[PDB]
């Protein structure tokens, strides 16, 4: 299970949401063997005055937070991150300079999905 | 201490915010013995175009993120999650299919509350 | 690396965003020796009806979430929190009663920055 939040300037979301959505999901399919339908994304559309970051990232600075189950090795997580960079550059033509990713991890017993404790599925 | 974020489509928040607020808080009172006043909730109201998830969850798909102190056992956390499901179904008549929960945990030394380091209280 | 999210009522953000931005960043410079430019802040502007908390915090209740790399000692984290309280009180004249802070920690291998795996920098 992966829950994804994508924070960006409003205009970046307007223009790129669809392209980002597919790029991110393709990374998860490729790396983690997710089913095509298992896509869960929240785009957090910020007014620029509320999104403050260094001038060496462009108007298309994007922060991706992926909340996942614990357990993947550091090397597997690094590869996932590289694939997200790649897919976003290739499909969105946003430079890796403008993309930032953080993975958060929690044990399965911390999740409820479809009325079930996730450890029980 | 529990900080709760509730992400949903705008219309779901409009119609259900009050009912969800009470249902969630009642779960915390029941399970964790919280005082009635110790309710801290942020409803994150999303335009549907920014909230992308599978078609087997309805317009009332809700994601609840509960940030709490570390230490509760896996079994206690699972029970908490079940009580949230129950209370939301009973009080909101939203099906468990549409409810998703993730607990995040941090040590007390990671928190500041009312000007104090939380470990010191 | 520190990613900061600041949640507040809309009017609190309007009046205090600049003052909070400097106060928080100064705390990070002072405590963690951050460069002056390494400021990354997202202000999450909430309508009051969506921001529910006890009546003993004022209209200027602010929640600061700082996502950082793992490894700092509990004592170093507590000091950081105290400095944030101080700077916000001194520079914003918001009482510590109204300020809440939580630090989240993840290993470096969980981050992508400027196209790089953060552990590799
Ligand atoms: Cl996805
Ligand atoms: Cl609550
Ligand atoms: Cl900062």
Author numbering:
A (entry chain A), B (entry chain A), C (entry chain A): 1 to 121
What do the authors of the reporting publication say about this deposited model?
The structure of AbTFM, with a single subunit in the asymmetric unit, was determined by molecular replacement and refined using diffraction data extending to 1.75 Å resolution. The resulting model consists of residues Met1–Leu121. Due to the lack of reliable electron density, the first two residues (Gly-His), which are remnants of the TEV protease cleavage site, and the last eight (Leu-Leu-Asn-Tyr-Gln-Val-Asn-Ile) residues are absent. The compact fold of the AbTFM subunit, in which about 75% of the residues are in elements of secondary structure, displays the characteristic β–α–β repeat structure of the longer tautomerase superfamily. There are three other short β-strands: β3 occurs in the loop linking β2 and β4, and β6 and β7 then form an antiparallel alignment at the C-terminal end of the polypeptide. AbTFM forms a homotrimer exploiting a crystallographic threefold axis of symmetry parallel to c. The interactions between elements of secondary structure on each subunit to form three seven-stranded β-sheets are important for trimer formation. The interface between each monomer creates three identical pockets lined with positively charged side chains. The shape and the charge of these pockets would be consistent with AbTFM binding a small acidic entity. The trimer presents three putative active or binding sites separated by approximately 25 Å. Each site is primarily constructed within a single subunit, with a combination of primarily nonpolar side chains and basic residues, in a relatively small depression formed between the β-sheet and the two helices.
